[PDB]
Design a binder for this molecule. Structure first.
Ligand SMILES: O=c1ncn2nc(Sc3ccc(F)cc3F)ccc2c1-c1c(Cl)cccc1Cl
Ligand SMILES: [Cl-]
Length: 330
């Protein structure tokens, strides 16, 4: 057990972590690794069963993720000396220093920067999806980028808000039980924005955003309507005047036509027929970056705990076990 010191920004961290300042997330200098780090404090982690399960979920996810393009755990600690006093979880990872919004604002991007940036999302996404994990909330603010344009994926709704602009229609409107290609829709929205500098579907609300979406990709055909299990949702869509799919070369004028092709494969209304991350990486657009030998998959991820109903203290004991058994990367 290392020595801890206290400071109010209350944060109680091992002395290896120095020069803490706010970003509940702090930036710090890790003196063991020489890396700048983001330290997240989970403050009321075992408050309800919902909360206690969420802490356990977060820790498990972060402990599993060992990929260059996914946020992993450099360290996890608690100032607590026993399960009895255990009540704080601190999570340490690499500091990148900016998200993807803080990147288009600062510089104009080449088709090359877009390639490298989207390649990295799909590479980490191939990895996340291989462990049968769905991000569900991919957005430029959940993408951590450093100065070398290297990228890591992090985390895992009313009106004119960015929180909803990148969501697949089937999830935004609870159409069906959704797969991992909801994340591919999100990448499509992100990619488009990188090429145009403008949000793809900046709807003022859920319906407006659906209209924007259907204007580009067309109204659903007979087959996808069948797959919409929400009878309420299916019934509304059919009230809309049929629209065909727009020409994407006319929407994304002057774009690398390979980039246009990949956007068409990504932004398919029927989630069953979207391109997967594994497939998208093999797309001609990433010929420059693609290396099937350097695009690894994840180890088995056991999420059978998700189906389990447990009392607060049980989720907390599980979380604790996971804290104390943590072995740092090397
Ligand atoms: O560069 C970053 N790298 C990591 N994170 N992590 C987190 S949260 C987190 C997750 C897992 C940890 F182990 C620890 C945590 F703190 C939040 C931001 C962040 C950034 C970052 C910064 Cl420092 C400024 C502006 C935008 C971003 Cl996306
Ligand atoms: Cl805009």
């Amino acid at each position: 057990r290392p020595t801890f010191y206290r400071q109010e920004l209350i944060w109680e961290v091992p002395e290896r972590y120095q020069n803490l300042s706010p970003v509940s997330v702090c930036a710090a200098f890790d003196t063991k690794t020489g890396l700048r780090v983001a330290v997240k404090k989970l403050s009321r982690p075992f408050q309800s069963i919902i909360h206690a399960k969420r802490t356990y979920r977060e820790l498990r996810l972060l402990k599993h993720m060992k990929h260059e393009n996914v946020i992993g755990l450099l360290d996890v600690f608690t100032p607590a000396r026993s399960l009895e006093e255990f009540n704080d979880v601190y999570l340490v990872t690499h500091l990148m220093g900016a998200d993807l919004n803080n990147i288009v604002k600062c510089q104009k991007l080449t088709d090359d920067h877009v390639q490298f940036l989207i390649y990295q999302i799909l590479r980490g996404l191939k990895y996340i999806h291989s462990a049968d994990i769905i991000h569900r909330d991919l957005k430029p603010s959940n993408l951590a980028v450093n100065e070398d344009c290297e990228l890591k994926i992090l985390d895992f709704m009313t009106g004119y808000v960015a929180t909803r602009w990148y969501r697949a229609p089937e999830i935004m409107l609870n159409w069906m039980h959704y797969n991992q290609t909801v994340d591919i829709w999100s990448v499509g929205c992100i990619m488009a924005e990188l090429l145009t500098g403008r949000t793809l579907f900046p709807g003022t609300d859920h319906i407006d955003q659906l209209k924007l979406i259907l204007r580009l990709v067309g109204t659903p055909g007979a087959e996808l309507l069948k797959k919409i299990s929400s009878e309420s949702a299916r019934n509304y869509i059919q009230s809309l005047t049929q629209m065909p799919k727009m020409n994407f070369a006319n929407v994304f004028i002057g774009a690398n036509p390979l980039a246009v092709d990949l956007l068409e494969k990504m932004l398919v209304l029927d989630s069953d027929k979207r391109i997967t991350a594994a497939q998208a990486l093999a797309h001609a657009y990433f010929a420059q970056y693609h290396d099937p030998d350097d695009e690894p998959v994840a180890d088995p991820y056991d999420q059978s705990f998700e189906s389990r109903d447990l009392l607060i203290d049980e989720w907390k004991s599980l979380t604790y076990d996971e804290v104390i058994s943590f072995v740092p990367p090397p």
